[PDB]
Symmetry: D3
Subunit: 148 residues, 6 copies
Amino acid sequence: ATSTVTGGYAQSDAQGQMNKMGGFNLKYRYEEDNSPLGVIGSFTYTEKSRTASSGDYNKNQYYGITAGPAYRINDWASIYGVVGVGYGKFQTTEYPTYKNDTSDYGFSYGAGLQFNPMENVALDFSYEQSRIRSVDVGTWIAGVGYRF
Amino acid sequence: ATSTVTGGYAQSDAQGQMNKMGGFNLKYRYEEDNSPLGVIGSFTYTEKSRTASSGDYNKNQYYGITAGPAYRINDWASIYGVVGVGYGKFQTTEYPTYKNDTSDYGFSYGAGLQFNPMENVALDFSYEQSRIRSVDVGTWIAGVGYRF
Amino acid sequence: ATSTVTGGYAQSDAQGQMNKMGGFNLKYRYEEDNSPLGVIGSFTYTEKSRTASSGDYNKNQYYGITAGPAYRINDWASIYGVVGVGYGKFQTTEYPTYKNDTSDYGFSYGAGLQFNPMENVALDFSYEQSRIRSVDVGTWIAGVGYRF
Amino acid sequence: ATSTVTGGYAQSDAQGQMNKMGGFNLKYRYEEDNSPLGVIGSFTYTEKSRTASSGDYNKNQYYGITAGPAYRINDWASIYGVVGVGYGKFQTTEYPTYKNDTSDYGFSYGAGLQFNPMENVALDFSYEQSRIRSVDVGTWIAGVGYRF
Amino acid sequence: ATSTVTGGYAQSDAQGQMNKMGGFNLKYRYEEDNSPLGVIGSFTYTEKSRTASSGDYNKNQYYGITAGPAYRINDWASIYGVVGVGYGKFQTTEYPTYKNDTSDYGFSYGAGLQFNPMENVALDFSYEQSRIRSVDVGTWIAGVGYRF
Amino acid sequence: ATSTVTGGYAQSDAQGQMNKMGGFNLKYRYEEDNSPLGVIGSFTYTEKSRTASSGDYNKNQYYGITAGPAYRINDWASIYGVVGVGYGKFQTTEYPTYKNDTSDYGFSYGAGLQFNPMENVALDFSYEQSRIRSVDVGTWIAGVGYRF
């Protein structure tokens, strides 16, 4: 009966050192008109590239694909929790021509909320966490969209 | 609870001169068994290519991605309105080898109806309009499908 | 209100001779909290490759894309029926360099069931059948997933 | 010591029925300043596509890659003979969606001449023949270029 | 009988405003042991990208493919002249999503020299000029390589 | 004045452990009619893939691109030496989804001979050696071809 589609800026940060990996998030939620329980799917992508004067180049990409239950608390607030899979791809080119690329999948989970300040508008805020090998990647998301 | 999937022929026409740009549309609608309000997403794609004896070639493609509320009026009729984004890509090859390609996005909106002459069948008719720079693109769609 | 996502192993077998074509299936089902009728979409892909000492190589791929109604019988059992389209691609390289590739679409249908031994878990079992030219392809699927 | 590069129009014709398959040829020849014997390599590509009102579509492509000795007879005339490999790719889409593609290699040979009406100019005329399965493909070529 | 292969840095500059477009050049020359006249082919590629704080992005690429006679003056010096074709591709993305891409071919010519300070070593210096529409692109090249 | 084109089987072996990496080589040589010194360019490619019951997969590819002087000793024998660059790409997928890919370039050199048992035929035998990081890759080649 109702769908909400939001998009915004996402920012990841891993165990200390990889700095801030920037990007975006999209979410699609569905609700019934006569039940407070629905579902929400999320797509997050962040990245960062570090080049140089030397020549050494490195590029990190993070993908987060999650889904879970969403619960409407009142006409202007809802909360949700999501689980799924995180994917990271690290590229490194060591001057002048050595190239080494590694990728792996890991478990991902998250939780968020949505507010409806106007009935057809949504403000979305969530946090997502992924493990991937032994590196804990945490991402914060602030989005906006429409409920139709 | 119910979904309806329809597909058909789409035909676009822009501010006068680009002639008839032909193609297709697909829509996916979802309804609850106990609410008349649901949602519908639409995908439209049209195109046209003009070649020659000279050599000058041009190709225009239009993409329309929209979504919105659908309201069931009775067992055989429903109406919906959609909003989203239109995308146009104009290619021109000026003989013998000059190539110039331009693309942009714009706001899109539309409205339609669906009839169910039999309970598991749907007849879909809609009109979509996109702006894209200063060119108003209007597309008419007639589709058929199944409700399951 | 509820979604169930399952994945598993799929195994196809065609009119006698193509042996067992192995692969996978994914399904996405949606249910309302206050109606036993919902919908389920299915994606199946199987394949097989036969090489040699001689050199003759052949590769067969099968894709099945179906959707239909799902009906919840009680808290732990549901049944569904699906219809859609099957696609097959047969590749053959006759030594030392002749290559012949053929592909076509046909009608597909299937039926299955799902059990929920725990409320957020699903066990999925279905059978899918496709025609494609004059070759009847039948595929068996056993999957597992989560309901959220 | 000297090179000649020519390009022109090529036209193939196979055992009767495939009509005229149109396209192009490029050749690169090399000569020594103090020997009349040199070498020449050739690249030929032709094609034809037949569409419809019905829907049946077919596309034929021919590639010819050959090389051999070139002999300069006087300051304005040379003759050459080439051998190598021909490649043909036949595509057929039988309405509404059956697709069948076949390709194979075969022996190719050819012979030609070049005239130099001015010392830095060349006029090239050759004929190429390929077998490929049991289909004899014969191609005529008329090119022009520069000797530097 | 002898070949020389050199590579180096290339830098283009067009009618005033496009600044310095950086890149590389490769050349392959061939000589006979008993004639001072031979041939040389050249491949040049340069580029430049300008991004921003605003968002407007532009990317210019230049390709130069030329060939011509090379004349050995003594054991350590040779001169050559080349002619061929220049290709330029200008990309521009006007924020937030307008994209306009244009490309064309034009005549190219150049001239250079090579020194052999040691018999198996070469130092290459040349200048290339291309027109392309009405924009005169001039490129300077300094390369090094081996004669074998 | 004369060219010789040969192709054959190549087999690489690295410092002990990577076993036998199989593949091919192509060479193009050019000779003048009145000098025993000419040039020859070589392209070598070998590979090996190791899969499993477990799931761990690894794939190694080796590319060798070399060129150098060729000297004709008599009407039936010639010797040559080549230098250039070797490239290796090692892929490893650690079950169930970790992927790690590394590539680098290194110096390559080789030496060979060619016999002409008949004037338009050639038998080619060479050995190529590449370093690439700290791994010494040695490849043996036996080819056949035509002199025209």
